[PDB]
Design a protein around this ligand. Structure first.
Ligand SMILES: NC(=O)c1ccc[n+]([C@@H]2O[C@H](COP(=O)([O-])OP(=O)(O)OC[C@H]3O[C@@H](n4cnc5c(N)ncnc54)[C@H](OP(=O)(O)O)[C@@H]3O)[C@@H](O)[C@H]2O)c1
Lengths: 112, 309
């Protein structure tokens, strides 16, 4: 029953330590002028964040290579079986189904 | 004797002294003597480093610092001995856990109304407040109108000043509001009746002094400080939330520097507009400044951009 005793112990030191740092001098009596001088060294910066694509694909591109290496995960439990040939013949398919899915897209990464 | 032009690195013949001159007001006067030329001897109490943000104010060899306590009758006698005019802004809000606050408007302004009178200052000055009346109010607001009585005895020439509730940049008057993110705005006392006072903008008061600083011909003759038009509404407390869109402290924190459940809540609603017959401002002018236009600047909050007011 002692796991949650070992988790909420950990946060409660951390969720404590924000206030004793952030908050404690935050109410101190120093000046702290409201002037809009903050947001350093790009003073104003008025724009939307524009769509920039080769930022985007490197999200998608991963998400799919991700899945099957969940599918690929239960090899070391499956190395203990009865008929094993249906493993080696089958196990090696996923991989090559992964590696193929590279080679195609590999004609165009662009600047990744 | 005045030389040249008033830019900086000039003379203009007046010395001064300004006691206090650390917190909101005094910092903002000396900055007008670090321009037209002076010799501004600013003493200060306890603060070694809180006085630095001041120093690029006079050119070079103009302002000069000393150290003093103020209950020692010598500390006020060592400086002033060479001076022309000496004004006095000293005094504060809440009773200190050390200074019992009773005579710090009585003994202190007299303690510096000691040898100053003797030693040959001239055009000595002191501060009053538009709302202080010797009838019964208000525990802090009282003892201030004693100085108008008790202290005026000494130095027959004063031109002691009587301004209103003032709104500066870093000031605590109009800033007690909008710090009120809280269980809710509760006016004083939950009534929209007698707000508001004459909210003059801090420039005009600090341009009054230096307009009387060599006036000439105002000594003994006290003045009071007009506000803008005209009286004001409850909306002033709504106006705060209309646009806002809803020294020597410590290392960590200060134990008590509160909202003071005491005179503070009742000092703001005491209103009492008072005698017009005081000259009191355009004569010392020429200044008067509004509110509606000058209250965006000092108020900037978490939108920081939109106004459309
Ligand atoms: N005319 C008005 O509209 C108005 C409005 C509010 C208040 N007042 C009163 O009129 C004067 C305006 O003061 P202010 O606007 O500049 O605000 P302030 O913060 O009270 O400035 C006073 C400065 O002198 C210091 N001080 C406090 N008690 C002192 C004492 N016994 N001896 C020497 N220094 C002392 C204060 O702290 P340090 O000792 O560390 O320097 C502060 O540095 C004050 O007396 C104030 O109580 C006037």
């Amino acid at each position: 029953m002692n796991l949650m005793l070992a988790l909420l112990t950990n946060f409660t030191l951390a969720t404590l330590l924000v206030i004793i740092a952030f908050w404690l001098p935050q109410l101190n009596v120093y000046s702290e002028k409201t002037s809009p001088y903050e947001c350093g060294f790009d003073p104003m910066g008025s724009a939307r964040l524009p769509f920039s694509m080769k930022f985007f694909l490197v999200a998608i591109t991963f998400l799919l290579f991700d899945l099957e290496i969940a599918l690929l995960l239960p090899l070391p439990w499956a190395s203990q079986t009865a008929n094993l040939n249906t493993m080696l013949t089958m196990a090696l398919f996923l991989i090559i189904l992964l590696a193929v899915s590279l080679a195609y897209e590999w004609t165009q990464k662009g600047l990744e | 004797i005045p030389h040249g032009k008033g830019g900086r690195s000039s003379v203009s013949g007046i010395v001064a002294t300004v006691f206090g001159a650390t917190g909101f007001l005094g910092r903002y006067v000396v900055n007008h003597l670090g321009r037209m030329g002076s010799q501004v001897i600013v003493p200060h109490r306890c603060e070694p480093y809180d006085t630095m943000h001041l120093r690029p104010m006079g050119d070079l060899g103009q302002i000069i610092f000393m150290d003093w306590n103020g209950r020692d009758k010598d500390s006020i006698r060592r400086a002033v001995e060479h001076s022309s005019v000496v004004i006095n802004l000293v005094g504060r809000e809440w009773e200190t856990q050390n200074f019992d606050f009773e005579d710090v408007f009585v003994k202190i302004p007299q303690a510096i109304a000691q040898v100053s009178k003797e030693a040959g200052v001239e055009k000595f000055i002191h501060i009053s407040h538009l709302n202080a009346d010797i009838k019964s109010s208000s525990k802090y607001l009282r003892s201030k109108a004693v100085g108008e009585k008790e202290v005026r005895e000494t130095f027959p020439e004063a031109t002691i000043i009587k301004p209103a509730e003032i709104f500066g940049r870093e000031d605590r008057f109009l800033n007690y509001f909008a710090n009120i993110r809280w269980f809710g705005g509760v006016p004083l006392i939950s009534l929209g009746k007698k707000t508001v006072k004459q909210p003059v903008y801090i420039v005009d008061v600090t341009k009054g002094i230096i307009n009387a600083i060599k006036d000439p011909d105002a000594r003994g003759k006290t003045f009071a400080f007009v506000g803008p038009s005209r009286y004001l509404l409850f909306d002033l407390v709504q106006y705060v939330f209309a646009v806002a869109h809803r020294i020597g402290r410590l290392f960590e924190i200060s134990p008590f520097e509160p909202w003071t459940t005491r005179d503070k809540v009742e000092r703001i609603h005491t209103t009492d507009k008072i005698l017009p017959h005081l000259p009191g401002l355009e004569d010392l002018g020429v200044e008067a400044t509004p509110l509606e236009l000058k209250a965006i600047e000092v108020l900037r909050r978490h939108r920081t951009y939109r106004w459309l007011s």
